[PDB]
Amino acid sequence: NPPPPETSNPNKPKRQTNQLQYLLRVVLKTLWKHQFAWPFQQPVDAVKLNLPDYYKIIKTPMDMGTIKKRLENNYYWNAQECIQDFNTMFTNCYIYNKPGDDIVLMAEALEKLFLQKINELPT
């Protein structure tokens, strides 16, 4: 396993924004409770899960546990940065797998709920 993504960085500029507040309180916390959320709640453990080729293929890993901690820690400057982390988590799943796989059916469901929730954000 490689080191997981950072959740703190003192030299990074950050802001507390009403859209970032919403991304934590509503968007992340709703997805988290979905029946298909559990494979995405922490970094991939290629050793436990016996996926030795995962980090040989995926070079920008991301997961909802990392996002949650970034949100709680005031890591982001704006909502587009957080939205980009979500998009990376979903794209990684489609790169490493194939259409029809159980994990892909799960990611497709969460991605549609995610887009429904960010369709309208607070001003």
Ligand X SMILES: CCN1C(=O)c2cccc3c(S(=O)(=O)N4CCC[C@@H]4CO)ccc1c23
Nearest residue to ligand X by CB is 39
Does 82 participate in binding ligand X (rule CB under 6 A)? no
* Type of residue numbered 102: D
Does 39 participate in binding ligand X (rule CB under 6 A)? yes
Q: By C-beta, is 36 or 77 nearer to ligand X?
A: 36
Name the minimum Å distance from CB 69 to ligand X: 17
Name the minimum Å distance from CB 63 to ligand X: 7
Q: Are 43 and 110 in contact (CB under 8 A)?
A: no
Does 40 participate in binding ligand X (rule CB under 6 A)? yes
Helix 79-96 vs helix 102-118: crossing angle, to nearest 10: 160
Determine which residue in the list 103, 109, 118, 121 makes contact with ligand X, applying CB under 6 A: 103
Q: Are 22 and 122 in contact (CB under 8 A)?
A: yes
Binding site for ligand X (CB under 6 A): 39-40, 44, 49, 93, 96-97, 102-103
